[PDB]
Amino acid sequence: MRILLCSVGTSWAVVPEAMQLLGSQGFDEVHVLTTASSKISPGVEQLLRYFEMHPGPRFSISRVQDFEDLRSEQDHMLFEEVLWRWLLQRAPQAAHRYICLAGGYKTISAAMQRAAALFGACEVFHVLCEPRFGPQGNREASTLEEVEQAIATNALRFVRLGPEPGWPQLRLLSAPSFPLESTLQGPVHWVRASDMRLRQHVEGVLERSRHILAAWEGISELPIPALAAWPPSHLRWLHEPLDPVQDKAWVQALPKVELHCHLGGFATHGELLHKVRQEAANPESLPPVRAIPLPPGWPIPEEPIGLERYMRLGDNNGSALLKDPGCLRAQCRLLYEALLADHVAYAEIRCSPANYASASRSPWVVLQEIRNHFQQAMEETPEDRRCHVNLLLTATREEGGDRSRIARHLALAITAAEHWKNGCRVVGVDLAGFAMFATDFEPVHRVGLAVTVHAGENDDVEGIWQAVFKLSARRLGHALHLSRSPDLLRVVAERGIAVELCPYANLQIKGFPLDEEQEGSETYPLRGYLAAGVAVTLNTDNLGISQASLTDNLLLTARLCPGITRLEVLKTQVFAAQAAFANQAERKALWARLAQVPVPTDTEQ
Amino acid sequence: MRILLCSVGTSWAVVPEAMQLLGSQGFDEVHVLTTASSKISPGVEQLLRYFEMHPGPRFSISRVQDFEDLRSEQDHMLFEEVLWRWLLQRAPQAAHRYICLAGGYKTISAAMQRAAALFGACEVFHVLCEPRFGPQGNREASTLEEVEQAIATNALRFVRLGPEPGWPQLRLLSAPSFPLESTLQGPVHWVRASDMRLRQHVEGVLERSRHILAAWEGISELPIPALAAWPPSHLRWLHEPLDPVQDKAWVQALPKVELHCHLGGFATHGELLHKVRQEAANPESLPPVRAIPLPPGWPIPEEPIGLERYMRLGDNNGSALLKDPGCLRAQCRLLYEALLADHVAYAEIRCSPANYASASRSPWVVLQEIRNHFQQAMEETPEDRRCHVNLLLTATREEGGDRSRIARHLALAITAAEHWKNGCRVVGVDLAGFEDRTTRAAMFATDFEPVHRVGLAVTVHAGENDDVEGIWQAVFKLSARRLGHALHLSRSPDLLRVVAERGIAVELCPYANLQIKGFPLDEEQEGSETYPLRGYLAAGVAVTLNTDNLGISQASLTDNLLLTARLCPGITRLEVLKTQVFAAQAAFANQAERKALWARLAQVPVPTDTE
Ligand SMILES: Nc1ncnc2c1ncn2[C@@H]1O[C@H](COP(=O)(O)OP(=O)(O)OP(=O)(O)O)[C@@H](O)[C@H]1O
Ligand SMILES: Nc1ncnc2c1ncn2[C@@H]1O[C@H](COP(=O)(O)OP(=O)(O)OP(=O)(O)O)[C@@H](O)[C@H]1O
Ligand SMILES: [Zn+2]
Ligand SMILES: [Zn+2]
Fold first, then answer.
1. Which among B311, B367, B402 is the best mutation to test ligand 2's pocket, defined by most ligand atoms within 8 Å of the CB?
2. Buried-state track A192-212, b at ≥16 Cβ within 10 A, e below 16
């Protein structure tokens, strides 16, 4: 099929000249666009007469209803939009599209050529006729007889511009999406354009394409491929040092990934604890709220408080309260609600069912209660904002305690792994007790559960070594002293063993220099880990005891580690996403969620 | 800095009027684009007089030497080429590029606009003149006095087409790269186009950009991010099944990766064996070349021959010959040549230095000689074709309990790991850990504790019947980071998931597996005994394709790759590329070697057919 589209100005003979472009083969369909000016009407009648005879191919004539003459740029946009829609409707297939720029204003020809290039056409040409017509033999043919004489005299010279590929994202635009109004009055189609949507869409597509092309070169220093579409100015802003104050709003909206969160350390004090206590099912076994004053300077302690004091800080919650089913469900729902506030797109809550199991509530019942509460809280949230939650069972050894709880927790995890396969699942076991525990963990690996190793109040480099190799771990928690063995900072980096760093937890437990101008020997080891290839993440540890969320941790990473580029923050998020204990469906959903990185709003300095 | 570029035609009053778009501001310099037609010479003289009587900003006139008048399309392409080059020479920066396209023909203005959009322009504007001039008071300005009175009377209604930001790969071009030759004739510069290299440059840039944008949506599915510049037809081609017959050349052209290539079976038979033998430093000490008839149909046996027989096929070479330094050097040089002839961008040759020791030659000396031979071979090759080769030491689990060689190999590996830090290096060990319920993978007994202690890697050789227990004992007790011939992995649905999650690569050898275990060939669908390549790939495992023993298997890396299309029905080309990328990513290289390998991998050879 061949459809020929041309615009006619003051001369109507252009269409007949182009009619014989390919010769006797002809064009199956011909469409002509013309202005509404009265001076064009005589040409319209002449062309109607010329079309009645030579009635071989189908014919139709289109006039721009709202355009008469070129007077300014507004009519410019008007006829540009009208021409775009007219060509879209009349030539749905680019391969069958032939266009001639002889007719219309010079700007009309330029705009039509631009439209062809942007949307594609089979061929573009301009028809020039010998001016051996009319009186004195010095004018172009302007009558039916003159046009016919020109056609049979081989006097038409065709300037074929060759194929025009079109544009990738704009080769599919169709008239139905951007319909054009046509009013029929005789044999002439009167065309009017409703809105400017198409031009705005084209401009946006072109701007996005140019941004993508500009950023295409460095497609490996961007953690997320979707960052390519970002404007070059935004990308340059991205690599600058992270400012803890001006970036609070942006870092608030990042879809984050929380991999180290304790369920028992969420509402240890404050209004959250009061809510948990009020939602209790049996408001008679609740222990008195013990007074546990916070250290001065909280949440930024003046000096470290050691691990033991840190744990003792949250003594109003946990096992000594969560044994009431109402309190447990209230705690779970409040934790999920707090997760939804920071736009956390994925989390792995760490819970210990045994600490909450009573005589009449076996640990399996408590774990099922928690899992189903979380599955509920997920199911009352739209998937476009849902925060998937997977559970980790903390199997912590007791200093002088009983291994019976460890057996309880390993068996519970092994059973929960197989029981559930959709929604909130049990992904792995956390070892908040690491020393070797080798044969105690052979069953866990045999069924394929992940294991994370929880380092706490420690300064040893053999614990980190035996975690990696004896009880094969896939994530190390709080391993702040790992460069002290240059042999292991090269196996953790080569085996992809993620290191979960908690800024506030590690600062409050131990304390590090803050907002230092230059890195020294006491600064936070985050950047040293990053530059060595380590998959270092950032988390919150205990949301309650630490008294701050993931956003605060990411923001204070700047003060703790000087000169950290927010691109490093995105790298940490991607590392967490790659380190999570997800499966194909959850992993794909998480990755689709991460691609929506919020745009900056103060990239002007 | 503000500049103006405009072509001129039969109406010479166009450039003067256009020069007042900024009005009283003026422009730093305006250049005139002109053709060789003689109908515009009076206009050129009028413009020269106007410039002389209106001094200040620099002025120039350029006439198209080869374009006298518009007759055919060739003049049009020449005009566009001249426009592009002249704009580059006079408008290297688009921030000061202002365009007025009043002059010329209809196609001249369209070419002006296309060039402006392609290379960007700060302002593109057109001039409309109110007809009030001439003797009849109806024509437009055509003389110097008419131009001046039109300017003063304000008969100009300029139109601004908007800014042209440009094109990312075409806004950085500089004039000197594509110089413009011009002949001076008084005040008018006579430009000339040396060639149309610029047009081809622009066309290539636009085509590559179109390919990038078309395949952009879905770059996460491309094994190599550099494939986004491939034509969409080629991207469709990649997603089709592989063909063993037509795809010989394309596979031969891939920059591949080798990870399972034993040095003791490279020249076990034939011309290579003779080349090795005649290189011995002690020709009279060479063991007699025995008779080792190959089974019929080799390298495609009509029935499986067994691991014992397969191993025995390599008697002519190995410990029999390689004790001689000359034979060792010949082996190394020929192996490197065989690698280069197959376009391998990274290899890990596993040797057994202790097996080649003598009374006067300690295992360390043999290892040093091998490493230095490979380093020399690497040094003489241009860096574009240099196949970075690392070494893996083999701790064979020979029956009987002999641990002298195993201990020696582990100690030698721990020593070489630090002795060398550039070029060819020792990167790990490849514990065989045989099957017979007495060695398995629990042979650890602290034997492999030191190798882990120093940061070395381990790669097991799951034998000819390990049965899921070996593949677990090795993964979870030896901390193996690769597994060889893990063909029964599908048995336990838990191992096929632990391997996928932990990212443990699986090394497969199509030809060796076919010749030893035997598999259905040329099948239409996938049955119980179908080769597990596609099964492993589906589950997410990181499967890699290698050669095992070059000499014994008598098939190079390309032969192994093409045999998958016969072993695994429906295997596609994109999956071959995915296997190459997995092999590259699962190798024991460091940052420098990995970066070189990744730079070498991006150069995928374009298909010869496309359909
Ligand atoms: N920040 C922390 N780092 C390491 N271990 C912690 C931390 N906070 C608590 N733990 C220990 O981890 C295990 C689980 O703690 P969780 O936060 O779930 O509270 P819990 O067990 O209910 O608290 P409690 O110590 O008051 O009985 C317990 O052994 C707890 O002592
Ligand atoms: N496909 C294979 N499967 C298992 N073991 C193998 C295989 N190929 C070689 N081996 C064993 O691994 C080692 C191979 O190393 P290499 O060939 O360099 O030494 P070699 O002593 O010269 O070998 P060979 O006995 O083959 O001549 C030898 O122990 C060989 O027995
Ligand atoms: Zn913790
Ligand atoms: Zn092997």
1. B311
2. bbeeeebbeebeebbebbbbb
Phi and psi for A269 in degrees, rounded to 5? Answer: -160, 160
| Nearest CB neighbour to A210, from listed B114, B168, B220 | B168
d(CA B41, CA B186): 14
- Please indicate whether, in this complex, the C-beta atoms of B113 and A117 are within 8 angstroms of each other: no
| DSSP state, residue B141 | P
On chain B, the residues whose CB falls within 8 A of the CB of A579 are none
Query: Ligand 2, atom 16: nearest CA belongs to which residue?
Result: B264
For chain A, the residues before each gap (C–N > 2.5 Å) are 434
> Residue A187 — left, alpha, or beta (φ > 0 → left; ψ -120 to 50 → alpha)?
alpha
Element (H, E) at A235: helix A232-238
Residue A327 near residue A277, CB atoms below 8 Å? yes
The neighbour count for residue A44, using CB atoms within 10 Å, is 18
Map B472-505 to HEC letters: HHHHHHCCCCEEECCCCCCCCCCHHHHHHHHCCE
d(CA B542, CA B496): 11
Question: What contacts A369, CB < 8 A, 6 or more positions away?
Answer: A325, A328, A329
Q: From B587, which residue of chain A is nearest by alpha-carbon distance?
A: A494
Q: How many CB pairs under 8 A join A and B?
A: 93
DSSP assignment of A485-518 equals STTTTTTHHHHT-EEEE-HHHHHHHT----S-SS
Q: Which residues of B268-303 are buried (b: 16+ CB within 10 A; e: fewer)?
A: bbeebbeebbebbeeeeeeeeeeeeeebeebbebee
* Contact indicator for A173, A197 with CB cutoff of 8 Å: no
Q: Considering CB atoms only, which of A160, A442, A533 is closest to B73?
A: A160
**How far apart are alpha carbons A207 and A599 in whole angstroms?**
16
Gyration radius (Cα) of chain A, Å: 36
Nearest CA to ligand 1 atom 29: A396
Tokens of A154: 């081989």
Q: Rounded to an integer, what distance in angstroms lies between the CA atom of residue B265 and that of residue B322?
A: 11
Residues A429, A445: Cα–Cα separation, whole Å: 10
Strand (E) or helix (H) holding B419 = helix B404-419
Radius of gyration of chain B from its Cα atoms, rounded to whole angstroms: 36
**B377 Cα to chain A: minimum distance (Å):** 28
The CA–CA distances, whole Å, from A405 to A185, A353, A416, B17, B544 equal: 89, 10, 16, 92, 43
Please report the DSSP string for A174-192 in residue order: -TTTS-EEEEEETTEEEEE
Q: How does B330-346 read in b/e, with b if 16+ C-beta sit within 10 Å?
A: bbbbbbbebbeebbbbb
Is A129:A156 a contact under the CB 8 Å cutoff?
yes
Q: Give B508-519 as a DSSP string.
A: E-HHHHHHHT--
List all residues of chain B from 506 to 535 with a beta carbon under 8 Å from chain A: none
Encoding tokens for residue A477? 């928690």
Contacts 24+ apart (CB under 8 A), B461-464: B461/B430, B461/B431, B461/B432, B461/B433, B461/B485, B462/B433, B462/B486, B463/B307, B463/B432, B463/B433, B463/B434, B463/B435, B464/B306, B464/B307, B464/B435, B464/B516, B464/B517
CA A525: distance to chain centroid?
Answer: 29
Q: Which helix (H) or strand (E) holds B100?
A: strand B97-100
Nearest residue, CB atoms, B503 vs list A209, A214, A496:
A496
* Residues near ligand 2 (Cβ within 6 A): B 262-265, 311, 314, 318-319, 351-352, 355, 394, 396, 432, 461, 512, 548-549
Q: Rounded to an integer, what distance in angstroms lies between the CA atom of residue B150 and that of residue A343?
A: 65
Beta-carbon neighbour count of residue A42 at 10 Å? 11
> What is the stated resolution of the deposited model, in angstroms?
3.2
